[PDB]
Amino acid sequence: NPIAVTLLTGFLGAGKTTLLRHILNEQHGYKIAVIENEFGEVSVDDQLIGDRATQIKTLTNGCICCSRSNELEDALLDLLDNLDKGNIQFDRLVIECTGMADPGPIIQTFFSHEVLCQRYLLDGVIALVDAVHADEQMNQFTIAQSQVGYADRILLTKTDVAGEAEKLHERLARINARAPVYTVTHGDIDLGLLFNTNGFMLEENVVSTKPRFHFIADKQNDISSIVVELDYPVDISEVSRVMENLLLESADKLLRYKGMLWIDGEPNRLLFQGVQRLYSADWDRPWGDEKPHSTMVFIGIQLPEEEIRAAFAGLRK
Amino acid sequence: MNPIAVTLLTGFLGAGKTTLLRHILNEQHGYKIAVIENEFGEVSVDDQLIGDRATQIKTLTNGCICCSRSNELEDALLDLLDNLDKGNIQFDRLVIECTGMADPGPIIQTFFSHEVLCQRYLLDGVIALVDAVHADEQMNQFTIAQSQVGYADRILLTKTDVAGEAEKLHERLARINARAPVYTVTHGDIDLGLLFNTNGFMLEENVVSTKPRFHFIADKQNDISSIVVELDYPVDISEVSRVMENLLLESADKLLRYKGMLWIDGEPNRLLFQGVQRLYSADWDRPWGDEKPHSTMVFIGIQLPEEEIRAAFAGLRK
Numbered sequence: 350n351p352i353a354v355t356l357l358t359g360f361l362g363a364g365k366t367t368l369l370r371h372i373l374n375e376q377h378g379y380k381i382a383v384i385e386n387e388f389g390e391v392s393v394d395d396q397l398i399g400d401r402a403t404q405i406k407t408l409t410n411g412c413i414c415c416s417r418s419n420e421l422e423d424a425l426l427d428l429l430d431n432l433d434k435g436n437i438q439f440d441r442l443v444i445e446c447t448g449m450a451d452p453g454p455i456i457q458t459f460f461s462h463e464v465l466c467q468r469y470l471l472d473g474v475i476a477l478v479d480a481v482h483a484d485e486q487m488n489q490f491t492i493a494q495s496q497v498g499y500a501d502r503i504l505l506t507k508t509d510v511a512g513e514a515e516k517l518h519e520r521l522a523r524i525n526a527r528a529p530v531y532t533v534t535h536g537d538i539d540l541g542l543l544f545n546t547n548g549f550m551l552e553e554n555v556v557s558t559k560p561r562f563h564f565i566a567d568k569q570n571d572i573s574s575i576v577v578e579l580d581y582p583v584d585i586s587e588v589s590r591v592m593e594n595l596l597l598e599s600a601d602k603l604l605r606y607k608g609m610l611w612i613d614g615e616p617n618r619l620l621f622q623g624v625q626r627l628y629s630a631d632w633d634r635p636w637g638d639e640k641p642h643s644t645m646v647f648i649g650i651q652l653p654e655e656e657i658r659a660a661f662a663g664l665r666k
Numbered sequence: 667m668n669p670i671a672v673t674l675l676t677g678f679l680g681a682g683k684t685t686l687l688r689h690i691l692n693e694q695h696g697y698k699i700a701v702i703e704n705e706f707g708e709v710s711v712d713d714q715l716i717g718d719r720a721t722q723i724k725t726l727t728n729g730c731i732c733c734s735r736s737n738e739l740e741d742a743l744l745d746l747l748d749n750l751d752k753g754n755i756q757f758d759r760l761v762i763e764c765t766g767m768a769d770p771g772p773i774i775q776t777f778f779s780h781e782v783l784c785q786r787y788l789l790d791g792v793i794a795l796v797d798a799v800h801a802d803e804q805m806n807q808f809t810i811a812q813s814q815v816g817y818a819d820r821i822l823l824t825k826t827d828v829a830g831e832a833e834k835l836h837e838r839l840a841r842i843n844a845r846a847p848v849y850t851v852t853h854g855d856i857d858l859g860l861l862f863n864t865n866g867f868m869l870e871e872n873v874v875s876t877k878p879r880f881h882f883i884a885d886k887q888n889d890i891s892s893i894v895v896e897l898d899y900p901v902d903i904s905e906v907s908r909v910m911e912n913l914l915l916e917s918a919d920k921l922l923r924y925k926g927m928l929w930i931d932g933e934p935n936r937l938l939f940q941g942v943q944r945l946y947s948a949d950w951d952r953p954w955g956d957e958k959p960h961s962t963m964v965f966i967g968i969q970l971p972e973e974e975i976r977a978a979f980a981g982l983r984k
């Protein structure tokens with residue numbers, strides 16, 4: 350049974366420490382291995398060093414705390430080794446990629462080798478956003494917007510003290526039109542919100558937040574989403590060439606992208622998804638009585654929206 | 667078996683990158699180079715084969731090789747070795763394009779991920795192309811623009827003929843990267859020799875080329891900066907080891923590159939070290955002899971706690 354991997358990202362907030370302190374110490378009933386930057390465990394049961402020098406600590410609550418070098422593969426493979434030998438037991442893996450950490454390279458690690466593809470299965474990317482400092486952090490650091498862009502789910506905290514932050518709701522939507530935004534106004538972040546996002550599965554509803562007309566404000570950010578709607582079918586060969594040219598032109602620019610396509614002559618939905626250079630497609634549920642259409646979303650920095658829309662517009666007969 | 671010399675070519679895209687790539691793939695220069703790029707500059711493709719990992723490898727008329735990459739760079743690197751061992755292709759230099767928004771970080775880490783890559787490939791250096799006309803603007807808007815400079819072992823500054831008095835730019839590049847020498851590329855094409863033989867990923871004793879001067883106000887302009895640490899006193903090898911390990915872990919996500927020469931208390935040999943992000947290594951070197959012993963270190967990164975770092979090394983004193 351594949352291990353469910355969750356990436357916890359977002360800028361330096363106080364809420365991240367509280368969440369990590371809850372996984373490592375309290376008894377929540379989850380079997381979680383954690384790769385973090387700091388030190389929140391106050392009850393270390395045992396400890397072992399893997400074949401690749403990975404420091405693996407077993408905690409009293411059953412959970413595991415794990416360190417990482419510059420090569421994440423080492424920690425991942427050492428966790429599997431000691432899992433197979435019954436040294437440790439865990440069902441979920443939570444990796445902290447907060448601060449200046451790029452979620453990109455971490456995601457790609459879980460697709461690098463065949464063994465990691467089979468033994469690990471990415472769940473989703475969770476972006477923690479502090480409503481008080483979000484705008485400032487995103488204005489100064491590109492990586493702050495990027496972490497939001499990679500997210501399958503955005504947890505917006507401290508809105509009770511940030512005041513009227515509807516403008517922030519919009520800005521997150523312009524950056525990431527895929528991820529729903531969860532706004533916790535009273536209480537803390539539930540641990541279960543990190544899991545079962547289904548973010549790395551083929552979706553038919555790729556766009557959660559419908560785009561609104563704000564020309565003078567929808568060009569502020571550097572990372573944005575491009576939502577493309579087609580009410581016409583396209584040739585599977587033609588659209589395949591367009592995508593391959595598109596994904597290569599903006600290779601370094603694209604964070605994540607998903608879409609549902611109406612293929613000319615095919616009675617089934619064609620779904621696709623991708624992260625940077627890695628992309629995959631597959632057929633799905635038949636159209637039936639539902640009116641056929643195409644819906645795609647491209648998240649990235651400095652995307653050539655004009656060229657992208659024009660390319661899809663030329664697929665019309 | 668001579669380890670293939672790998673060069674990373676970074677910097678914000680422009681006319682200096684396309685012309686340079688078009689010269690490597692087409693013109694006769696005498697280098698046996700394999701190129702991994704994003705575009706398609708070569709015109710005269712001689713032969714083409716597909717690797718066992720679906721790598722598209724093209725042999726060119728000028729002898730050079732053009733290669734494609736998926737999201738996993740290991741695939742192309744291992745397929746190049748496969749067809750090199752089988753005599754299908756021949757090259758002794760590898761040039762990887764990481765221009766635009768590309769982060770040099772993950773690419774650097776690829777060449778340390780596995781033992782085979784450590785022996786067959788040898789990271790020469792990171793070459794950063796800089797447009798004198800647009801540099802200040804790009805660096806103000808994009809953190810990645812400063813980062814690419816921060817990773818550089820050599821900075822090629824171009825379009826200085828159109829920019830003119832780009833002296834304020836020299837200083838800003840120096841504050842960002844105090845390791846890398848700056849080469850003002852004269853008008854025209856960037857010469858191919860400026861990309862090669864930097865010895866950037868070897869242990870150096872002269873870690874700082876551009877010794878920092880006093881420019882307090884302008885030294886708070888960037889997010890990525892260098893911290894030059896000078897010590898005129900020896901340190902306990904255990905004490906300094908604890909300080910570095912705490913430093914590297916505290917600023918794990920922040921550190922781009924770092925190098926240093928250390929005066930170890932009781933040891934007659936120089937201790938050199940170098941690192942890229944989380945990956946770091948140290949080793950002894952040339953003995954001191956008649957040369958006056960001292961320590962010189964440089965830390966390049968974003969939002970570095972300079973105060974804490976200097977204080978930590980200051981506490982290593984007796």
Ligand SMILES: [Zn+2]
Pocket residue numbers: 385387388389390414415
């Ligand atoms: Zn821990």
Ligand SMILES: [Zn+2]
Pocket residue numbers: 703705706707708732733
């Ligand atoms: Zn090419």
Ligand SMILES: [Zn+2]
Pocket residue numbers: 422461462740779780
């Ligand atoms: Zn690998």
Ligand SMILES: [Zn+2]
Pocket residue numbers: 833836837
């Ligand atoms: Zn100068």
Ligand SMILES: [Zn+2]
Pocket residue numbers: 852853
């Ligand atoms: Zn001249």
